[model samples]
Target: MFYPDPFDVIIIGGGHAGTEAAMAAARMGQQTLLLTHNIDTLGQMSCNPAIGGIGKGHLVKEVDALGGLMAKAIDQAGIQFRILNASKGPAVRATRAQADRVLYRQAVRTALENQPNLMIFQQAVEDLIVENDRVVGAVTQMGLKFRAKAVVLTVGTFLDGKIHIGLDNYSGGRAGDPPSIPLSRRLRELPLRVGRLKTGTPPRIDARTIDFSVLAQQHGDNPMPVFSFMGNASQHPQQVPCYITHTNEKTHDVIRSNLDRSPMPSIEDKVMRFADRNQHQIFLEPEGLTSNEIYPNGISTSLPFDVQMQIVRSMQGMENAKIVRPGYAIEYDFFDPRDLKPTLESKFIQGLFFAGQINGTTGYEEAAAQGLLAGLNAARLSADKEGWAPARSQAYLGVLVDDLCTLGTKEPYRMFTSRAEYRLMLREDNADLRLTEIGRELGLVDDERWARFNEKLENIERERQRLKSTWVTPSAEAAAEVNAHLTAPLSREASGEDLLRRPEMTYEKLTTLTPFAPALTDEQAAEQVEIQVKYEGYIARQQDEIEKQLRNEN
Candidate 1:
């Protein structure tokens, strides 16, 4: 059988990468089709029911600025929201959200369903349709051929996936999903390089059986954080709290004693390697609002069920906790990302783009960012246009792509702020300022977002000018009024921007003065202004560092 109308871009997979790619391509006005083995698992949080943290959050925000769906979906499904490292510098601070798995998937599906120029089909792609070193389409499991000008392979960990639990192991993509064996074989036939990488998920616990009262509770921030530029705190679901527990001596003993039965890199490996540490913290995070399951965060293992039981029982406040799902590790194929161009398209296979774990990277944020770029570029490729990627100094997504393409990963590469040289200038709060115009040029950003972005820019510019122009004088009355809010009384006149540069003065405190009254009402815009003002010096220095390094490159 053959498909009637050909797709402009075809994406194989429905995980974070595929979903974002499909959406981006569709939004770019390309006729896009998303082929997945299972429709229900689209946007499934395979390991953690969470999104964004540190460098990952920066990627999510960048994706959002470029008209990607992760931030919006997370906002709709997030159950707990927090600003990580709130007291730290703005460049390092990040947003994280605990999501309801079902809600997150539903949110993603809803967006996909509503998306025009896109179609979702339930099928496994068995092989790529390559012609003259160019990918033309894909062949589904049932011999159904669907043609497309560009193909994005975001197959994730399903390519010849193998799950290991203690001494026993089985062929599986995830816990229950099946591996893409035939496609994996077909892909191996290509000139592209591939290698193996492993990732694990901790066992889920039955919350009802756990002694939660004994565990110390961790609560979400009082003022909830939003993920998307278009999203607000109102989109978030009912908030919930997580509990913290630790692995004591008994837990270590159980893990150590069962090392013989354990698979490679099990919790046993962690215990053995970190011999100096007496205990490890495990966050008991709720899986969803409707479910009684809790994910034991930090203790990922592939131990046998019997050994897993002992480990759980030994942990504090989990003495009676019943294991809902046994922890397991899966090893699968990943391509050497260095083999691909910055566009995420294959250097050898034209029109073939790769994203997610297929590029030897770990984490949903990384996958989603890659997917957005690949999908956007695939659409451009179909239209006979040049593909684009940001410079390392511009966005974290850029840093990720450049790193992968320049120096391939032997293990699963995860994004970190430390990985980027100019992180001080590439901040999560100002993702839109950095990338929205590029998104606009690429046709990924919508008119609504563009308008909002323009308004935000105007607000920031207006505030900046106001801060630079507004001055506090050493006049008796003015000095007396402003001095109360300042730690040190003004010996000389200073501008609003000058006062803000002081270590003790924040935008809020400085703006409280009558001279600086009527501060920006929009909290998001205000936050951006504050960050820009406070970090202006550091940001300038980071830019200087980048320039010096670039000069040395010659």
Candidate 2:
């Protein structure tokens, strides 16, 4: 076995978190090695082929602003795009994309391959070559050792992983994937306290076998939303419709009858106990552009194969459906995120770091965001520079990490708009405005991207100024148009910015009234204009609340 030279950082597992972690470190000019069990599965969508929903999309934009790769990869690979919460306030409005799984994997691999200081090696890390309690390096399954100053573990459901499909269960990382048995055992020997948590994915169905006529078609919203600040509506592939279906009484009945045959339910009698018996709901989702496999979203079970088949057949449009892969639940080890510092470095292990599902998060977006933070801090450690974390009032990513560390989550942590008190300030359109400067200071944001970001900032500022200065009388045709939906028409004159606060008024609709309305990018126009207009009062209140919290901390 060939052992490589020492790297500044080493990241284990190449899922969403690991990919971003490695990229962030490498982009910071650190020599980084990303080790994974399989190269083909790098950035593979183990569960869903979508990114950014509700709170998750906030993290994706944060990742993009920090020069992390997930948002860009999703933009390049997404087959369908939609903005959630269009009717809601801007802070809650988020961009979600249905990604092409194959294209996404390729995009990540291409980024890793082309990275200046990053190397991709296909290997399973089985042991930590630690001297004392601090991590020094790692040893692969083949007995080759690679040294690194810092290590980030993004092992997603792989440590002591057990997959259950019906009553038949096996030790595996994912379906058809091997578990990191030796590494799991090795980590158990450490002083770190670990606990078991379970998450599962539903079975895949052959779309060709399902009858689509009976299903409810959910189409992308008009004026499709993009995930990345750099992404455009034109960047999205030919949009496709997603169908909505729910588990019925008959479907629930089939699942209830098969509880005795489920490995998860049987665990009640074993060392592993079933936590709750809440009935699981299955969501039917299209996999990708070229594939016929539809992912059943909600129902995750480890029931017997026959029982799984029965559950599938009971659903509408799935009477004769073929199961591509049976749904299974995986139980693995997780460290309480509270155990780590704000920077994601372990409180006990100086050079050690943790991210992703191992940090007790459920979504790919959550994992990737943490990975970027960990990688940034790890690279800072290598350079003997001070590491930084964003505050709750700063970025949604900051709030996520702080909440994980301070509050400690009971269920798997997912992002929601309500989680951010400063949602008005944390709009998706201005993520680059908020973080790109920091990225540039850290040497993460490239000159080209930074320049483009600056141009966007100038456009946004100019547009805001123009709106604030422009006034319209209630009698004006434009004011009437804007106030059409208002219960009472405006009594007097109002600024273009104030007109935007009306229920019926939007930036797009105000274009006719304001002559200086620049042709801003969807992201720029959507996020900046909305935040400036809709939530100014709430934003000011939240800012004062944040100040009080900071004073208490001091």
Candidate 3:
């Protein structure tokens, strides 16, 4: 059996990568289908239910700017929100939030259900139907066929996945999910290059069984920071706090006593345990409001169940903590990302795109970014349009795809701001300014976002002009107010923009400097204006690099 009308694009899997790809295609007005083994697992948080960190937050914003859904989903499901490196400079600062896994999946599924031109089907893809070296469709496990102009394989960690807990081993795609046996076999028959990657999750504890009084409580921000361009703190569900409990000498002895029973730390992970640290730090994260299980963050092990129990009980607050689910290490096959172009399309197999763990990246944010690029490009291919990716100087997402396709990876690659050369201009505060225009041009951004973006742009331009035109001088009435925050007094008349260049001065403080110096009402717009004014010289130099690369004619 086969579908009568062919899809414009088909995506396999339902993790962060797959969901974003499906949503992107649908946003492009393509008839897109997202095929998953189980509908319930759509947008499931297979690992930690946290979104964004350091460079990851920048990627999320870029995705949001391009009209993707990860950041928006997190804003709905996020329980705890904090700005990491809060005291640091703008480029290094990032927003991170802990999410409720169930709520997170629900939020994503809701978006998918409401998305136009997108269809969800419950089935496992068994093989790709490639015609003349271009993917034309996919065949399901039930021998049903569906055709598509382009196919995106965001299989995540499911292809030939194997779980190991000490001596015991089983075929599995995470802990509860099943491995893709037939498809992995069929994929191996293709010309694509593949290799194995190993990563694991920690055990879950029954929070009721643990002594919470003994642990240090960790809370969210006083007023949480918003993630999506379209999100705010109000969309967040009931917030919950996590606890901190570290391992001691007893925990070390327990692990040492049961070394043979641990599959991960028995090797190189053992070398890590040997050198500097005698103690292991574990974050007791609340799973959700509806669940009793709490995730123990740091102890990502695949030790035997009995040994895992021994290790957990060794901790201070977890003296009687009952293990709800034991941790298991997984090793799965991933294609070398270098084999694919920056848009994530396979050079060897036209119309076939790879994203997520399939491309040797580890974090959910990384996967979602890849999915958006791949999905956008797949839709473009279907529409007979040329595919594009943002420049390295533009976004962290750009840096991610460029690194994967250019230098490739030997280990699991995660995003870091240091990887970007022009990070000074790629700060999280201005992601929309960097990518929203391009997204508008691509047809991914809708009318509302386009209008909102234009408004913000207008505000920035207006504010910049006003500040440049509005002058402040030592002879002004409010000279003392402006002079108080500065190292040196104003020697001559200066524009408000020039006054803002003072290291000790800020727009927030400057707004009250004089009566005629009006401020922007929009908080986000104000932040952009401040950033632009503060870093004008550095940003101008960065523009030369951007223009030079844009002129290379790639």
Candidate 4:
């Protein structure tokens, strides 16, 4: 395919980050072209088939609010959905979804194809064409040139990627995928500071061969949790069960016995080894609804194929398991994220941006958030507008970028609820409420999503106000139910919102207290209302802290 005019924006790589980047830019009305090495692997879940966990879920919600495609894609393709940390406080609760890998890729591809002003092309970017220290375009491996005003490089782990399994190692972007060697070498010649980081995946097992009786069964949350602001229970598929199993002493012993043979432990190896030997655990996870391929979650190694098989067989459910693919570790090049500004544009090369695992992040959510920010900024620059970045206290995405740019990461950076200092104010349910207005103004969010988000916001406000006004007397049925969970009875009268603040009191228990408690979905009603009431004071304090920080920044 050939184009006469320079593209408004060009995105490289087709992983989670690139997919969102292209979609966000297209939504902003920028003529965008997403170039990838393989169309088949677009949005492929290279590591785990799951999305969202802990602070990562917050990023997904924020992306959805901004009209990014990740949340919606997962919603359409998700085979299992659950709320993580349900027993804990709402601030820490996160929604996770297990996807059918093939379906997820198709969903993302369909979204990209259907997006206006966006074009998809299959080619490996070999080298960047720079003019006066600014990226003007990129050259493909086949010697084809693509001109663009701005470029977002979400190269993922493909830059100089080398996969190691025991004594055998080969060049690859992922298992069975080709590595971009010429491109990696070309990138190293750029002015940016670069380094190598390592990550690993566990061996896959056949589900039929495993013994489920000995393993612990884990099921998705009741009433099916959704990831996107636009996503509802009906959008999700039937939830599936996930089985759990841990590494035994014998398993640990086998690993210990072969420590010298493992590429991860080999000191002479170029890849940095950071995982503690004693803390190793393995999780047995189902791949999808139809496929029998089981993924071993925790045990990621660069051990030899034989050693990997021995480790797999040592586990309880995998006593007679066959290794579908050998466990391996990948070491790839990553630019220091600190070198880029908040917009993810390179300080050294104007119009050039980077995102995804290439920026040293470990999860799909983290990459997608960065990609959306980068893509939006690229589109804005093309349109002669200023780029916007959320404050650290405003969104989890902000905290991630700030942390990466400020501190930099040695090992792969994973998102955690505790990482955000203002997490009390950055709840997942309110992501759309907080970001959609800004996105709408920027043309990043569409009218349909914006309208839906506004409706939800209005509903939340109405419910909150009702809870604040409704009083719970000591003798009232609502007060009795509330007091039953509380240490002491209400002496006089308290608002329903006040009663909700009690440690044991919950939104579910307040249903009988007031008719105003609006009908909420399983995930939204129980979690959102509880957090709104319980953490209102704390959220206010954090908002004050954010204000103070902003003033200091100014």
- Cα displacement (angstroms), candidate 3, residue 77, comes to 0.3
The total number of steric clashes, by the backbone 3 Å criterion, in model 3 comes to 0
State each candidate's clash count: 0, 6, 0, 2
The sequence of per-residue lDDT tens digits that candidate 3 reaches over residues 1-554 is 89888889999988888998999999889999999988877788878878888888998998999999988889988889888999987878999898998888888888888889989999888888888988889999889999999999888334688888878888887776678888888888887777787887778898789988877888988788998887767888888998898888877776666766555433226524575777656788888879888988777676778877887888887878897778878888888888888788899988988888788888999989998999999999999999998777668888889999989887789888788977777888788988899898898999998998899889889888898898777887688766677788779998888888766768878887664356899889998888878777667777777778668735
- Ordering by TM-score: 1, 3, 4, 2
Residue pairs with backbone atoms closer than 3 Å in model 4 (clashes) = 166-303, 166-304
lDDT, model 4, position 307:
78
Using lDDT as the measure, name the better of candidate 2 and candidate 3: 3
Kindly report which residue stretches of model 3 are placed more than 4 angstroms away from their true locations once superposed.
Answer: 264-274, 540-554
| Candidate 1 clashing pairs, residues 3+ apart or interchain | none
lDDT of 1: 0.85
Query: What's the TM for model 1?
Result: 0.96
Residue range 1-554, candidate 2, lDDT tens digits: 44757788999888788888898999889899999888887778887888888888888888998898888788788877777787876666777888888788888888788889988999888888878877888888778999888999888334678876655678877777778788878877776767777876767898899988987777777777666666666766776788877655676666556676664422213212332443333456677778889887666666667777887788777889998877778778777887889898988877988888887888888989998999889999988899999988789998899999889876678888887876666787778888999999999998888888888778778777777897878776755654665567889887877767765556665654444255456456555766666655566687787678778756
The residue pairs found clashing in candidate 3 are: none
Ordering by lDDT:
1, 3, 4, 2
Model 2 / residue 391 / CA error / Å: 1.5
Give the higher-TM-score candidate: 1 or 3.
Answer: 1
TM-scores for all candidates: the values are 0.96, 0.88, 0.95, 0.90
Tens-digit lDDT string for candidate 1 (138-201) = 8998899999899889883346888887788899888887888998888888776778877777
- Pairing residues by index, what is the TM-score of model 3? 0.95
